[PDB]
Structures are given as structure tokens and as C-alpha cells.
PDB file of C-alpha atoms in Angstrom:
ATOM      1  CA  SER O 272       0.116  -0.058   0.061  1.00 25.30           C
ATOM      2  CA  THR O 273       0.846   3.686  -0.275  1.00 27.41           C
ATOM      3  CA  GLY O 274      -0.462   6.890   0.955  1.00 28.10           C
ATOM      4  CA  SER O 275       0.010  10.509  -0.417  1.00 26.60           C
ATOM      5  CA  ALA O 276      -1.366  13.638   1.368  1.00 28.12           C
ATOM      6  CA  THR O 277      -0.833  17.345   0.721  1.00 29.01           C
ATOM      7  CA  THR O 278       0.517  19.431   3.790  1.00 31.89           C
ATOM      8  CA  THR O 279      -0.361  23.197   3.844  1.00 32.26           C
ATOM      9  CA  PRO O 280       1.361  26.047   5.777  1.00 33.23           C
ATOM     10  CA  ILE O 281      -0.877  27.237   8.555  1.00 31.55           C
ATOM     11  CA  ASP O 282       0.267  30.945   7.986  1.00 28.17           C
ATOM     12  CA  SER O 283       2.198  33.315   5.742  1.00 24.96           C
ATOM     13  CA  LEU O 284       5.404  32.497   7.728  1.00 23.48           C
ATOM     14  CA  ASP O 285       5.258  28.591   7.343  1.00 23.02           C
ATOM     15  CA  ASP O 286       5.049  28.417  11.103  1.00 25.80           C
ATOM     16  CA  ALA O 287       3.845  24.914  10.876  1.00 26.11           C
ATOM     17  CA  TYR O 288       2.121  22.655   8.334  1.00 25.38           C
ATOM     18  CA  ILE O 289      -1.182  20.794   8.556  1.00 26.11           C
ATOM     19  CA  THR O 290      -2.303  17.589   6.873  1.00 24.65           C
ATOM     20  CA  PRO O 291      -5.715  16.157   6.729  1.00 28.31           C
ATOM     21  CA  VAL O 292      -6.324  13.015   8.519  1.00 30.74           C
ATOM     22  CA  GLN O 293      -9.470  10.772   8.557  1.00 29.26           C
ATOM     23  CA  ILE O 294     -10.363   9.252  11.791  1.00 28.81           C
ATOM     24  CA  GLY O 295     -13.204   6.951  12.658  1.00 29.75           C
ATOM     25  CA  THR O 296     -16.235   5.623  10.877  1.00 30.59           C
ATOM     26  CA  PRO O 297     -17.838   7.631   9.196  1.00 30.49           C
ATOM     27  CA  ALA O 298     -14.631   9.607   8.766  1.00 30.57           C
ATOM     28  CA  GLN O 299     -13.913  12.687  10.851  1.00 28.33           C
ATOM     29  CA  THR O 300     -11.237  14.750   9.102  1.00 27.71           C
ATOM     30  CA  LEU O 301      -8.881  16.756  11.360  1.00 27.02           C
ATOM     31  CA  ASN O 302      -6.042  18.822  10.268  1.00 31.38           C
ATOM     32  CA  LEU O 303      -2.803  17.484  12.208  1.00 31.59           C
ATOM     33  CA  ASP O 304       0.525  18.651  12.473  1.00 32.33           C
ATOM     34  CA  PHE O 305       2.935  15.781  11.239  1.00 31.79           C
ATOM     35  CA  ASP O 306       5.822  15.790  13.645  1.00 33.43           C
ATOM     36  CA  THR O 307       8.953  13.698  13.119  1.00 33.17           C
ATOM     37  CA  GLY O 308      10.215  14.952  16.491  1.00 34.46           C
ATOM     38  CA  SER O 309       7.416  13.162  18.672  1.00 35.87           C
ATOM     39  CA  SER O 310       5.453   9.893  18.627  1.00 36.65           C
ATOM     40  CA  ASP O 311       1.966  10.594  19.857  1.00 37.70           C
ATOM     41  CA  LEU O 312      -0.954  10.861  17.685  1.00 34.67           C
ATOM     42  CA  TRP O 313      -3.292  13.229  19.687  1.00 32.44           C
ATOM     43  CA  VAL O 314      -6.372  15.164  18.793  1.00 34.65           C
ATOM     44  CA  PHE O 315      -8.659  17.942  20.139  1.00 31.23           C
ATOM     45  CA  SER O 316     -11.795  15.989  20.970  1.00 25.58           C
ATOM     46  CA  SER O 317     -15.281  16.125  22.619  1.00 21.03           C
ATOM     47  CA  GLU O 318     -13.447  15.429  25.947  1.00 20.19           C
ATOM     48  CA  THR O 319     -11.179  18.518  25.731  1.00 19.61           C
ATOM     49  CA  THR O 320     -11.870  21.048  28.529  1.00 19.03           C
ATOM     50  CA  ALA O 321     -14.332  23.385  26.707  1.00 18.19           C
ATOM     51  CA  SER O 322     -12.525  26.668  27.675  1.00 18.22           C
ATOM     52  CA  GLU O 323      -9.382  25.215  26.026  1.00 20.97           C
ATOM     53  CA  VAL O 324     -11.051  24.799  22.667  1.00 21.14           C
ATOM     54  CA  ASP O 325     -11.084  27.936  20.378  1.00 23.39           C
ATOM     55  CA  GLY O 326     -12.008  26.892  16.683  1.00 23.25           C
ATOM     56  CA  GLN O 327     -10.221  23.506  16.386  1.00 23.68           C
ATOM     57  CA  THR O 328     -12.119  20.649  14.824  1.00 24.10           C
ATOM     58  CA  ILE O 329     -12.566  18.010  17.339  1.00 25.25           C
ATOM     59  CA  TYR O 330     -12.850  14.144  17.250  1.00 21.65           C
ATOM     60  CA  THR O 331     -15.888  12.726  18.825  1.00 22.36           C
ATOM     61  CA  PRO O 332     -15.294   9.083  19.518  1.00 22.35           C
ATOM     62  CA  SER O 333     -18.983   8.393  20.471  1.00 27.03           C
ATOM     63  CA  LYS O 334     -19.898   9.187  16.765  1.00 28.26           C
ATOM     64  CA  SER O 335     -17.349   6.631  15.444  1.00 25.62           C
ATOM     65  CA  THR O 336     -18.686   3.045  15.129  1.00 24.47           C
ATOM     66  CA  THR O 337     -15.079   1.767  15.136  1.00 24.25           C
ATOM     67  CA  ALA O 338     -13.740   3.712  18.110  1.00 22.94           C
ATOM     68  CA  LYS O 339     -13.001   1.730  21.240  1.00 21.74           C
ATOM     69  CA  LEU O 340     -11.707   3.093  24.574  1.00 21.82           C
ATOM     70  CA  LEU O 341      -8.209   1.647  25.389  1.00 23.04           C
ATOM     71  CA  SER O 342      -9.208   0.971  28.994  1.00 23.39           C
ATOM     72  CA  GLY O 343      -6.963   2.482  31.557  1.00 23.00           C
ATOM     73  CA  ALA O 344      -4.566   4.146  29.082  1.00 22.78           C
ATOM     74  CA  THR O 345      -3.407   7.767  29.585  1.00 22.28           C
ATOM     75  CA  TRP O 346      -0.961  10.023  27.989  1.00 19.17           C
ATOM     76  CA  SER O 347       0.725  13.265  28.833  1.00 17.16           C
ATOM     77  CA  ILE O 348       3.409  15.133  26.654  1.00 18.90           C
ATOM     78  CA  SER O 349       5.516  18.202  26.912  1.00 16.08           C
ATOM     79  CA  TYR O 350       7.241  19.576  23.884  1.00 15.62           C
ATOM     80  CA  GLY O 351      10.472  21.538  23.633  1.00 17.44           C
ATOM     81  CA  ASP O 352       8.643  24.948  23.205  1.00 15.85           C
ATOM     82  CA  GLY O 353       7.054  24.433  26.711  1.00 15.12           C
ATOM     83  CA  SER O 354       3.590  23.477  25.345  1.00 15.65           C
ATOM     84  CA  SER O 355       1.854  20.302  26.514  1.00 16.07           C
ATOM     85  CA  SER O 356      -1.206  18.236  26.382  1.00 18.50           C
ATOM     86  CA  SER O 357      -2.735  14.995  28.063  1.00 20.40           C
ATOM     87  CA  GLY O 358      -5.771  12.720  28.118  1.00 19.29           C
ATOM     88  CA  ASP O 359      -6.981   9.199  27.515  1.00 15.88           C
ATOM     89  CA  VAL O 360      -6.907   6.938  24.537  1.00 16.64           C
ATOM     90  CA  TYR O 361      -9.135   5.312  22.014  1.00 16.38           C
ATOM     91  CA  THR O 362      -8.233   2.881  19.197  1.00 15.79           C
ATOM     92  CA  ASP O 363      -9.956   3.714  15.782  1.00 14.95           C
ATOM     93  CA  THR O 364      -9.345   3.603  12.147  1.00 14.42           C
ATOM     94  CA  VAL O 365      -7.009   6.209  10.742  1.00 13.87           C
ATOM     95  CA  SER O 366      -6.237   7.306   7.187  1.00 12.55           C
ATOM     96  CA  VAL O 367      -3.776   9.547   5.571  1.00 11.01           C
ATOM     97  CA  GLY O 368      -3.775  10.174   1.933  1.00  8.71           C
ATOM     98  CA  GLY O 369      -5.514   6.860   1.209  1.00  9.30           C
ATOM     99  CA  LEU O 370      -3.368   4.726   3.510  1.00 11.90           C
ATOM    100  CA  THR O 371      -5.332   3.162   6.267  1.00 11.59           C
ATOM    101  CA  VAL O 372      -4.450   1.769   9.727  1.00 12.52           C
ATOM    102  CA  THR O 373      -6.899  -0.065  11.784  1.00 14.48           C
ATOM    103  CA  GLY O 374      -6.522  -0.033  15.556  1.00 15.09           C
ATOM    104  CA  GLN O 375      -4.357   3.144  15.710  1.00 16.78           C
ATOM    105  CA  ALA O 376      -4.165   4.767  19.120  1.00 15.14           C
ATOM    106  CA  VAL O 377      -5.718   8.044  18.878  1.00 14.71           C
ATOM    107  CA  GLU O 378      -4.854  10.002  22.016  1.00 12.69           C
ATOM    108  CA  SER O 379      -7.821  12.199  23.019  1.00 14.21           C
ATOM    109  CA  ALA O 380      -6.909  15.463  24.687  1.00 15.74           C
ATOM    110  CA  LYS O 381      -8.498  16.224  27.978  1.00 17.34           C
ATOM    111  CA  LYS O 382      -6.289  19.168  28.491  1.00 18.26           C
ATOM    112  CA  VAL O 383      -4.014  21.262  26.251  1.00 18.90           C
ATOM    113  CA  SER O 384      -1.864  24.262  27.062  1.00 19.29           C
ATOM    114  CA  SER O 385      -2.495  27.712  25.939  1.00 17.82           C
ATOM    115  CA  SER O 386      -0.369  27.748  22.805  1.00 16.84           C
ATOM    116  CA  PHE O 387      -2.591  24.835  21.429  1.00 17.17           C
ATOM    117  CA  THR O 388      -5.697  26.559  22.228  1.00 14.87           C
ATOM    118  CA  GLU O 389      -4.509  29.837  20.624  1.00 14.46           C
ATOM    119  CA  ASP O 390      -3.697  28.137  17.414  1.00 15.54           C
ATOM    120  CA  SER O 391      -7.154  27.327  15.735  1.00 16.77           C
ATOM    121  CA  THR O 392      -5.604  25.860  12.694  1.00 14.05           C
ATOM    122  CA  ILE O 393      -3.978  22.718  14.322  1.00 13.90           C
ATOM    123  CA  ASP O 394      -6.406  20.096  15.442  1.00 13.06           C
ATOM    124  CA  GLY O 395      -3.638  17.843  17.042  1.00 13.36           C
ATOM    125  CA  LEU O 396      -0.349  16.255  16.195  1.00 11.46           C
ATOM    126  CA  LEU O 397       0.644  13.089  14.371  1.00 14.92           C
ATOM    127  CA  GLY O 398       3.954  11.850  15.576  1.00 13.98           C
ATOM    128  CA  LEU O 399       6.479  10.281  13.248  1.00 14.16           C
ATOM    129  CA  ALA O 400       9.575   9.872  15.425  1.00 15.93           C
ATOM    130  CA  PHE O 401      10.210   6.237  16.896  1.00 15.61           C
ATOM    131  CA  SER O 402       7.612   4.554  18.942  1.00 13.27           C
ATOM    132  CA  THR O 403      10.037   4.358  21.911  1.00 15.30           C
ATOM    133  CA  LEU O 404       8.977   7.967  22.681  1.00 15.21           C
ATOM    134  CA  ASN O 405       5.271   7.477  22.740  1.00 17.52           C
ATOM    135  CA  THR O 406       3.906   8.573  26.132  1.00 20.66           C
ATOM    136  CA  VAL O 407       1.074   6.285  26.626  1.00 20.62           C
ATOM    137  CA  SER O 408       0.891   4.393  29.916  1.00 16.47           C
ATOM    138  CA  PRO O 409       0.953   1.729  30.958  1.00 18.42           C
ATOM    139  CA  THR O 410       1.015   0.181  27.530  1.00 20.88           C
ATOM    140  CA  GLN O 411       3.152   2.147  25.196  1.00 22.38           C
ATOM    141  CA  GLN O 412       1.450   2.618  21.548  1.00 18.24           C
ATOM    142  CA  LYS O 413       2.928   2.489  18.051  1.00 16.45           C
ATOM    143  CA  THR O 414       2.999   5.530  15.689  1.00 16.62           C
ATOM    144  CA  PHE O 415       0.824   5.635  12.494  1.00 17.12           C
ATOM    145  CA  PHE O 416       4.087   4.840  10.604  1.00 16.27           C
ATOM    146  CA  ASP O 417       5.062   2.042  12.719  1.00 15.61           C
ATOM    147  CA  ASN O 418       1.566   0.426  12.343  1.00 17.18           C
ATOM    148  CA  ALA O 419       1.578   0.949   8.678  1.00 18.63           C
ATOM    149  CA  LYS O 420       4.954  -0.213   7.827  1.00 16.47           C
ATOM    150  CA  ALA O 421       4.507  -3.729   7.150  1.00 16.31           C
ATOM    151  CA  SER O 422       1.775  -3.074   4.634  1.00 11.30           C
ATOM    152  CA  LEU O 423       3.668  -0.251   2.684  1.00  9.08           C
ATOM    153  CA  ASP O 424       5.258  -1.101  -0.575  1.00  7.03           C
ATOM    154  CA  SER O 425       8.573   0.140   0.885  1.00  9.12           C
ATOM    155  CA  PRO O 426       9.039   1.018   4.673  1.00  8.19           C
ATOM    156  CA  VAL O 427       9.492   4.639   4.220  1.00 10.23           C
ATOM    157  CA  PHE O 428       7.819   8.116   4.362  1.00 15.36           C
ATOM    158  CA  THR O 429       8.929  11.242   2.717  1.00 17.38           C
ATOM    159  CA  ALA O 430       8.612  14.924   3.669  1.00 18.86           C
ATOM    160  CA  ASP O 431       8.431  17.562   0.869  1.00 22.69           C
ATOM    161  CA  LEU O 432       7.549  20.841   2.530  1.00 25.09           C
ATOM    162  CA  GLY O 433       6.909  23.968   0.686  1.00 28.92           C
ATOM    163  CA  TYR O 434       8.207  27.431   1.126  1.00 30.25           C
ATOM    164  CA  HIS O 435       5.140  29.553   1.386  1.00 31.72           C
ATOM    165  CA  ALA O 436       3.360  26.987  -0.546  1.00 33.00           C
ATOM    166  CA  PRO O 437       1.729  23.492  -0.038  1.00 30.02           C
ATOM    167  CA  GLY O 438       3.911  20.270  -0.119  1.00 28.19           C
ATOM    168  CA  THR O 439       3.518  16.564   0.370  1.00 27.94           C
ATOM    169  CA  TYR O 440       3.868  13.702   2.722  1.00 26.41           C
ATOM    170  CA  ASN O 441       4.141  10.286   1.056  1.00 28.41           C
ATOM    171  CA  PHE O 442       4.000   6.945   2.665  1.00 28.45           C
ATOM    172  CA  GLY O 443       5.462   3.794   1.149  1.00 27.61           C
ATOM    173  CA  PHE O 444       7.039   5.110  -1.912  1.00 26.92           C
ATOM    174  CA  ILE O 445       9.726   7.597  -3.165  1.00 26.62           C
ATOM    175  CA  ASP O 446       8.371   9.970  -5.850  1.00 26.02           C
ATOM    176  CA  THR O 447      11.262  10.283  -8.276  1.00 28.29           C
ATOM    177  CA  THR O 448       9.658  13.263  -9.892  1.00 28.17           C
ATOM    178  CA  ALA O 449       9.718  15.302  -6.732  1.00 27.35           C
ATOM    179  CA  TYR O 450      13.465  16.073  -6.559  1.00 29.68           C
ATOM    180  CA  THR O 451      16.403  16.917  -8.747  1.00 30.02           C
ATOM    181  CA  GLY O 452      19.701  14.991  -8.888  1.00 29.17           C
ATOM    182  CA  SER O 453      20.198  12.048  -6.477  1.00 30.37           C
ATOM    183  CA  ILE O 454      19.226  11.301  -3.006  1.00 30.99           C
ATOM    184  CA  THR O 455      22.072  11.177  -0.561  1.00 31.50           C
ATOM    185  CA  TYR O 456      21.530   8.840   2.466  1.00 32.30           C
ATOM    186  CA  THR O 457      23.027   9.193   5.926  1.00 32.74           C
ATOM    187  CA  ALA O 458      23.044   7.161   8.970  1.00 32.64           C
ATOM    188  CA  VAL O 459      20.609   7.452  11.868  1.00 35.99           C
ATOM    189  CA  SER O 460      20.803   6.965  15.505  1.00 33.98           C
ATOM    190  CA  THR O 461      17.627   5.866  17.154  1.00 36.09           C
ATOM    191  CA  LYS O 462      19.100   5.976  20.670  1.00 38.04           C
ATOM    192  CA  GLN O 463      17.098   9.022  21.846  1.00 39.70           C
ATOM    193  CA  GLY O 464      14.041   8.080  19.762  1.00 42.69           C
ATOM    194  CA  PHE O 465      14.621  10.649  17.081  1.00 44.08           C
ATOM    195  CA  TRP O 466      15.592  10.650  13.379  1.00 40.35           C
ATOM    196  CA  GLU O 467      19.152  11.830  14.689  1.00 40.95           C
ATOM    197  CA  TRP O 468      21.858  12.254  12.059  1.00 37.78           C
ATOM    198  CA  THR O 469      25.352  13.969  11.698  1.00 38.86           C
ATOM    199  CA  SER O 470      25.626  16.816   9.239  1.00 38.14           C
ATOM    200  CA  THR O 471      29.044  17.101   7.623  1.00 38.83           C
ATOM    201  CA  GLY O 472      29.357  21.017   7.812  1.00 39.11           C
ATOM    202  CA  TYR O 473      27.987  24.275   6.595  1.00 39.32           C
ATOM    203  CA  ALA O 474      28.531  27.343   4.476  1.00 38.72           C
ATOM    204  CA  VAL O 475      27.155  30.931   4.908  1.00 40.33           C
ATOM    205  CA  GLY O 476      26.223  32.543   1.590  1.00 43.16           C
ATOM    206  CA  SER O 477      28.880  32.324  -1.092  1.00 45.30           C
ATOM    207  CA  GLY O 478      31.542  31.469   1.615  1.00 46.96           C
ATOM    208  CA  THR O 479      33.774  28.395   1.872  1.00 46.53           C
ATOM    209  CA  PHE O 480      32.317  25.195   3.277  1.00 48.80           C
ATOM    210  CA  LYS O 481      33.353  24.398   6.881  1.00 49.07           C
ATOM    211  CA  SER O 482      33.766  20.639   7.418  1.00 49.84           C
ATOM    212  CA  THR O 483      32.494  19.879  10.810  1.00 50.32           C
ATOM    213  CA  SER O 484      30.243  17.178  12.341  1.00 49.04           C
ATOM    214  CA  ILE O 485      26.844  18.576  13.627  1.00 48.05           C
ATOM    215  CA  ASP O 486      24.661  15.924  15.174  1.00 48.34           C
ATOM    216  CA  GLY O 487      20.917  16.938  15.152  1.00 50.15           C
ATOM    217  CA  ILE O 488      17.534  15.703  14.541  1.00 49.20           C
ATOM    218  CA  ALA O 489      15.203  16.032  11.467  1.00 48.00           C
ATOM    219  CA  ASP O 490      12.078  17.589  12.930  1.00 48.06           C
ATOM    220  CA  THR O 491       9.090  18.599  10.923  1.00 50.39           C
ATOM    221  CA  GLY O 492       7.415  19.749  14.086  1.00 52.04           C
ATOM    222  CA  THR O 493       9.909  22.541  14.834  1.00 52.99           C
ATOM    223  CA  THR O 494       9.554  25.654  12.693  1.00 52.83           C
ATOM    224  CA  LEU O 495      13.264  26.936  12.823  1.00 53.21           C
ATOM    225  CA  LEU O 496      16.742  25.690  12.396  1.00 52.60           C
ATOM    226  CA  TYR O 497      18.588  25.450  15.665  1.00 54.66           C
ATOM    227  CA  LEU O 498      22.520  24.941  15.464  1.00 55.01           C
ATOM    228  CA  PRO O 499      25.489  25.474  17.749  1.00 54.15           C
ATOM    229  CA  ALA O 500      26.091  29.170  18.871  1.00 58.60           C
ATOM    230  CA  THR O 501      29.403  29.151  16.836  1.00 59.21           C
ATOM    231  CA  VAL O 502      27.762  28.320  13.462  1.00 54.96           C
ATOM    232  CA  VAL O 503      24.773  30.740  14.141  1.00 53.94           C
ATOM    233  CA  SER O 504      27.034  33.628  14.995  1.00 55.31           C
ATOM    234  CA  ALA O 505      29.024  32.974  11.802  1.00 58.99           C
ATOM    235  CA  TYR O 506      25.763  33.233   9.909  1.00 58.54           C
ATOM    236  CA  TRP O 507      24.235  36.365  11.485  1.00 58.99           C
ATOM    237  CA  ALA O 508      27.737  38.108  11.286  1.00 59.81           C
ATOM    238  CA  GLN O 509      27.100  38.304   7.530  1.00 58.68           C
ATOM    239  CA  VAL O 510      23.856  40.501   8.125  1.00 56.97           C
ATOM    240  CA  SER O 511      24.468  44.187   8.945  1.00 58.84           C
ATOM    241  CA  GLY O 512      22.742  45.080  12.026  1.00 58.38           C
ATOM    242  CA  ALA O 513      21.788  41.581  13.212  1.00 56.60           C
ATOM    243  CA  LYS O 514      22.130  40.814  16.806  1.00 55.63           C
ATOM    244  CA  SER O 515      20.991  38.301  19.431  1.00 56.74           C
ATOM    245  CA  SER O 516      18.316  39.949  21.640  1.00 57.70           C
ATOM    246  CA  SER O 517      17.705  38.381  25.004  1.00 53.85           C
ATOM    247  CA  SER O 518      14.211  40.243  25.240  1.00 51.58           C
ATOM    248  CA  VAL O 519      13.036  38.959  21.974  1.00 52.18           C
ATOM    249  CA  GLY O 520      14.516  35.508  22.588  1.00 55.55           C
ATOM    250  CA  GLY O 521      16.980  35.178  19.730  1.00 54.91           C
ATOM    251  CA  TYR O 522      18.662  36.691  16.746  1.00 52.09           C
ATOM    252  CA  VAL O 523      16.763  39.533  14.917  1.00 54.80           C
ATOM    253  CA  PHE O 524      17.857  41.486  12.050  1.00 54.45           C
ATOM    254  CA  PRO O 525      16.810  44.581  10.150  1.00 55.63           C
ATOM    255  CA  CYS O 526      13.794  43.912   8.017  1.00 55.45           C
ATOM    256  CA  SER O 527      15.428  45.889   5.216  1.00 57.65           C
ATOM    257  CA  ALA O 528      18.180  43.391   4.927  1.00 57.47           C
ATOM    258  CA  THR O 529      18.680  40.865   2.210  1.00 58.88           C
ATOM    259  CA  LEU O 530      19.636  37.542   3.820  1.00 57.44           C
ATOM    260  CA  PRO O 531      22.408  35.209   2.657  1.00 60.98           C
ATOM    261  CA  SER O 532      21.702  31.519   2.057  1.00 60.00           C
ATOM    262  CA  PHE O 533      22.799  28.815   4.457  1.00 60.02           C
ATOM    263  CA  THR O 534      24.205  25.535   3.238  1.00 58.48           C
ATOM    264  CA  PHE O 535      24.377  22.279   5.294  1.00 59.31           C
ATOM    265  CA  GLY O 536      26.225  19.060   4.352  1.00 59.00           C
ATOM    266  CA  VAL O 537      24.709  15.628   3.901  1.00 60.14           C
ATOM    267  CA  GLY O 538      27.720  13.467   3.355  1.00 59.50           C
ATOM    268  CA  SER O 539      29.437  14.966   0.380  1.00 61.47           C
ATOM    269  CA  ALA O 540      26.289  16.552  -0.818  1.00 62.20           C
ATOM    270  CA  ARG O 541      24.941  19.998   0.003  1.00 61.37           C
ATOM    271  CA  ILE O 542      21.508  21.374   0.642  1.00 65.83           C
ATOM    272  CA  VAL O 543      21.186  25.165   0.106  1.00 66.13           C
ATOM    273  CA  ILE O 544      18.580  27.091   2.187  1.00 66.14           C
ATOM    274  CA  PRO O 545      17.799  30.282   0.385  1.00 63.41           C
ATOM    275  CA  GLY O 546      18.089  33.467   2.365  1.00 63.40           C
ATOM    276  CA  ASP O 547      14.200  34.195   2.091  1.00 65.24           C
ATOM    277  CA  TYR O 548      13.629  30.938   3.952  1.00 63.63           C
ATOM    278  CA  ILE O 549      15.250  32.485   6.994  1.00 64.11           C
ATOM    279  CA  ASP O 550      13.149  35.542   7.211  1.00 64.97           C
ATOM    280  CA  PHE O 551      10.378  35.249   9.915  1.00 62.02           C
ATOM    281  CA  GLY O 552       9.070  38.850   9.601  1.00 61.54           C
ATOM    282  CA  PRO O 553       8.509  41.463  11.999  1.00 62.03           C
ATOM    283  CA  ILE O 554       8.927  40.490  15.693  1.00 64.79           C
ATOM    284  CA  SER O 555       5.674  42.398  16.442  1.00 66.62           C
ATOM    285  CA  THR O 556       3.195  43.812  13.889  1.00 67.69           C
ATOM    286  CA  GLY O 557       4.621  46.837  12.192  1.00 63.84           C
ATOM    287  CA  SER O 558       8.167  46.539  13.682  1.00 63.56           C
ATOM    288  CA  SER O 559      11.206  46.898  11.487  1.00 65.02           C
ATOM    289  CA  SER O 560      13.016  44.270  13.456  1.00 63.72           C
ATOM    290  CA  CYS O 561      12.648  40.799  11.805  1.00 62.10           C
ATOM    291  CA  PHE O 562      13.086  37.398  13.504  1.00 63.25           C
ATOM    292  CA  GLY O 563      15.699  34.995  12.224  1.00 60.19           C
ATOM    293  CA  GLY O 564      15.013  31.532  11.041  1.00 59.83           C
ATOM    294  CA  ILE O 565      18.494  30.161  12.237  1.00 59.98           C
ATOM    295  CA  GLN O 566      18.773  30.362  15.963  1.00 60.70           C
ATOM    296  CA  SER O 567      21.203  28.994  18.538  1.00 60.08           C
ATOM    297  CA  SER O 568      20.426  25.439  20.044  1.00 59.42           C
ATOM    298  CA  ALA O 569      22.420  26.282  23.221  1.00 59.07           C
ATOM    299  CA  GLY O 570      20.238  25.441  26.260  1.00 59.56           C
ATOM    300  CA  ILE O 571      18.024  23.254  24.129  1.00 60.13           C
ATOM    301  CA  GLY O 572      20.542  20.377  24.425  1.00 60.86           C
ATOM    302  CA  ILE O 573      20.230  19.061  20.855  1.00 61.44           C
ATOM    303  CA  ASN O 574      20.519  20.600  17.312  1.00 60.52           C
ATOM    304  CA  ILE O 575      17.367  20.665  15.406  1.00 60.36           C
ATOM    305  CA  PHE O 576      16.965  20.672  11.632  1.00 63.29           C
ATOM    306  CA  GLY O 577      13.382  22.094  11.612  1.00 65.36           C
ATOM    307  CA  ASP O 578      11.165  23.148   8.771  1.00 65.46           C
ATOM    308  CA  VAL O 579      13.556  26.020   7.774  1.00 63.59           C
ATOM    309  CA  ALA O 580      16.115  23.306   6.741  1.00 60.27           C
ATOM    310  CA  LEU O 581      13.818  20.482   5.768  1.00 58.83           C
ATOM    311  CA  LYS O 582      11.814  22.640   3.302  1.00 61.50           C
ATOM    312  CA  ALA O 583      14.824  23.103   1.305  1.00 59.33           C
ATOM    313  CA  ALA O 584      15.123  19.441   0.532  1.00 58.05           C
ATOM    314  CA  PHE O 585      13.137  16.276  -0.411  1.00 63.01           C
ATOM    315  CA  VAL O 586      13.722  14.022   2.795  1.00 66.36           C
ATOM    316  CA  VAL O 587      13.325  10.395   2.837  1.00 68.84           C
ATOM    317  CA  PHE O 588      12.671   8.930   6.440  1.00 70.28           C
ATOM    318  CA  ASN O 589      13.692   5.255   5.718  1.00 67.64           C
ATOM    319  CA  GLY O 590      12.300   2.966   8.459  1.00 68.98           C
ATOM    320  CA  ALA O 591      14.051  -0.247   7.151  1.00 70.04           C
ATOM    321  CA  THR O 592      15.468  -2.436   9.974  1.00 67.43           C
ATOM    322  CA  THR O 593      18.466  -0.093  10.014  1.00 65.24           C
ATOM    323  CA  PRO O 594      16.947   3.303   9.650  1.00 66.59           C
ATOM    324  CA  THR O 595      18.482   5.971   7.604  1.00 66.86           C
ATOM    325  CA  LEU O 596      17.637   9.551   6.285  1.00 64.98           C
ATOM    326  CA  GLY O 597      17.873  10.672   2.646  1.00 67.26           C
ATOM    327  CA  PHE O 598      18.210  14.355   1.405  1.00 67.72           C
ATOM    328  CA  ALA O 599      17.841  15.567  -2.106  1.00 66.99           C
ATOM    329  CA  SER O 600      17.732  18.918  -3.687  1.00 65.09           C
ATOM    330  CA  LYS O 601      14.520  19.945  -5.348  1.00 66.55           C
TER     331      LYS O 601
END
């Protein structure tokens, strides 16, 4: 089997991407944030505290003839941005882009933190990291990909995120029309539950490439590119007036600037992030200070190849017995 679904930016900045997902019988379609940095499929629901729902579409298990309470199971997750959610668990039929999994754990939110309530466009998350990170207790549950894997034509999914445009998540096949050149594959460590890999270096603009190992995670659920402070300082030093602002929470730059590109290494290959992808717009409405899309990972404890980096590439998440990641230009 295969599936193919379009993923759409939630706003003009590509702060996140939503993909329609069919849950239950008859189908209830919710727009979920596909997150290769976590491993829970959770949704706003008929059980979510009413004051914490503000425009989201909810899953109502009592209206699904295939829903079943997973008796005794609870979940609770906290994300790197400080947001969180928790609740109980149903199993139900879940389909993405024509690919169907029966018996998928659908984690129904009883509580969500304010940033989830405040984002009316995201109806929940669909985790695509390794199932070892799934938070369901006392019986840990499998991700949608893990459940689908054996049925797929090939045990892979691909992320093709757009810059200020829709893109695609494919399951079970690699669309050879969706990228240019060849795909370079690189080793993955699953020891922390992430799609963790080692970039071979970077360049700023037209500058020379610096060969240096940068361990980090491929995380579709993180907006920005978070790298070591040395690398990030070298980037922003090429932008007149750019500075790290403790009050804003990272590097800002004059909105009048033209940003340089940023290149990262994948083995001997190179992925180029155009400068425009690094512009996250005014820090507050009408400000001439703009927020940077490359930020320091110092204090986060891990480097994160988030959407800013991933959207510059066609990315293969290879879930073969020994997982690997593939990157191609596009």
C-alpha cells in the first residue's frame, strides 16, 4: 500500500504545516501537524476542556462506530517549546492520503496548554519519530508509520515541505519526480528516539564550506533551524545590524536586509537554504526588526533541523530495519 497527502502552511510564515487525516467511521477529518520529533497521535476532542477549545475541529469518539476506549490508558506530553497536552486513549481507524491503519491509538486530549488553544488551525499532532518516545501508559503505543510499515510497498515516508506553498507527505514510496539529482542517504541513531543524524558541515552565503560534524534531528514539528552558537554567530555576522536579543528570545535583523543563504552538508552533498527561507518577519506587527530563522540550540541540548532546513530538501525517512535519512535538492 501507499498514501499521499498534501501538507499546507498554517500561515504566511510557514510556522507549521497541517495535513488532513481521516479518523473513525464515518470519517472525521482533522488537520494534524505531522511531527517527526514526537511519537504521539493526539487530537482535540469532545473530551477537551471546553475553555481550551477555540476554533479547532474535534474528534468525537462516540460518533465513530469503530472507536474503542483503550481501557486504563493515559498520555501526557511536553514539547520543547514548553507546550503540553494530556488525556485518555481510543483505538480507531486512521487514514492518511488513502493509506489506512486499523486499531491506531488516537490520544484524546482532556487538557491542552495555551499555545494549542490559541492556534485554531491545528487540530492535533501526528507523531512520526520512533515509537519508543510514545507517552501512553501503562502500555506504550505505536505511531501511525510503525503500524502501517509492514503493509507499505517500501518501509519509508517522505517529507516535501513547501516554502510559502503546499507540499506533500508520501508513505510507502519515493516519488522520483519530486526532486532533482540524487538522494544522499546518511546514518541515523535511534538511541534518543529521534531521526538523529550528523551533518558534515555548513557554509554561509557564497563562503567556503566548513567541514565539521553537527549532530541533530530531522524535526518537521519544529519551525526553525537550531544549530550550535558558533555556527549561528557566523551566519548572522554576515547580516548588517543583526544581533541576539535576550528580550526577544533570539537573533533579530533589520527587516530591510537581504539575507544570505545557508548550506548544510549531507555526506558529500549539499543542501542550500535560500536567504528568504530564513526571514520570519517582524517581531511584532509593524516592527522593522525581523526574527531570524536560524537560532542557537544552546540550552536546548540538541541541534534541530526544523522546517527551515527540511523545506529546502526532499527528505526520505527510511524505516528499514536499520533506519537512515535521505536528502535531495528539489
